[PDB]
RNA sequence: UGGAGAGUUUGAUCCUGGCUCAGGGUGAACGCUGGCGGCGUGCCUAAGACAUGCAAGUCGUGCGGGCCGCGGGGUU
C-alpha cells in the first residue's frame, strides 16, 4: 500500500571524555505513487531503529501532489537554505531526470516524466526539503481559479 | 520534445570554495592486440631543403619554309 525507500544513511559523532560516540541518521521517503508523498529524517543509536523512525516521521509528514498525466502542472523553483531545486514538467516518454534524492521523492509521488536541476548546495537533506516544499507549493488551474473567485 | 550528479577541508555539522571523476568530441599519437569488406580520411611540425618522371597546350580550315623520301611534268 505504501512504498518506502531510504535516501541516505549517515553516522554522526559527538565527543565525550573517552572518545567519540556515534548516532545514525537516515532519510526515508514513502509514497503510494498516486499523488501522496512523505519525507522523514530519523536519528537513533543504531541504523535499523533510525530507518524505522524515519519511516514513521515520513508517514506523519505527507504532501498531496497534483499530478497532470504523470507530470507536474507548472515549473517550480525553491530555495531551501543554500540549496535550490528547479522543477519543470515534461511530455510523456521523457522519464524522470533528477539527482538521486529528487528522483526517489518524485518517483514515489507517482511522477513519470519531469526535468529537474539541483543548484547551489548539493546537500541531500536540504535538496530533499526543497523538493518537498516545491511539491507543497504546486497549484492546479482549479486552485488558481478558486483563489480568484471574489 | 528539453536540464541527473558524485568524491574531497571536520571528531561530527552547515556554508563558502577550489581540485578531481562519470559524458561527448579529434586530421590524433603511443602501448598491448589484431580476421574480412564498404565508405571516408591521412605533414597539425621546417611557408625547411629537394634527385627524378609527369603535371599546358592546341590549331596545316591563318602563313611561308628547312630536312628526309616518293610520284608526275618542261628536255633526245
Ligand atoms: K528562501
Ligand atoms: K562528508
Ligand atoms: Mg495540492
Ligand atoms: Mg542563499
Ligand atoms: Mg558550491
Ligand atoms: Mg508543444
Ligand atoms: Mg513547450
Ligand atoms: Mg564540491
Ligand atoms: Mg579547518
Ligand atoms: Mg579526517
Ligand atoms: Mg571543531
Ligand atoms: Mg573525456
Ligand atoms: Mg573522453
Ligand atoms: Mg603488431
Ligand atoms: Mg579504403
Ligand atoms: Mg586516398
Ligand atoms: Mg604546412
Ligand atoms: Mg588543428
Ligand atoms: Mg579557322
Ligand atoms: Mg623527281
Ligand atoms: Mg618537243
Curated annotation (Swiss-Prot):
Keywords: Ribonucleoprotein, Ribosomal protein, RNA-binding, rRNA-binding. GO terms for biological process: translation. The keyword Ribonucleoprotein applies. InterPro entries: Ribosomal_Su5_D2-typ_SF (IPR020568), Ribosomal_uS5 (IPR000851), Ribosomal_uS5_bac-type (IPR005712), Ribosomal_uS5_C (IPR005324), Ribosomal_uS5_N (IPR013810), Ribosomal_uS5_N_CS (IPR018192), Ribsml_uS5_D2-typ_fold_subgr (IPR014721). GO terms for cellular component: small ribosomal subunit. It holds the Pfam family Ribosomal_S5_C. GO terms for molecular function: rRNA binding; structural constituent of ribosome. Residues 2-65 form the S5 DRBM domain. The keyword Ribonucleoprotein applies. It comes from the Bacteria. With S4 and S12 plays an important role in translational accuracy. Located at the back of the 30S subunit body where it stabilizes the conformation of the head with respect to the body. Binds mRNA in the 70S ribosome, positioning it for translation. Part of the 30S ribosomal subunit. Contacts proteins S4 and S8. Is positioned such that it could physically interact with spectinomycin. Belongs to the universal ribosomal protein uS5 family. The N-terminal domain interacts with the head of the 30S subunit; the C-terminal domain interacts with the body and contacts protein S4. The interaction surface between S4 and S5 is involved in control of translational fidelity. This is Small ribosomal subunit protein uS5. It comes from Thermus thermophilus (strain ATCC 27634 / DSM 579 / HB8).
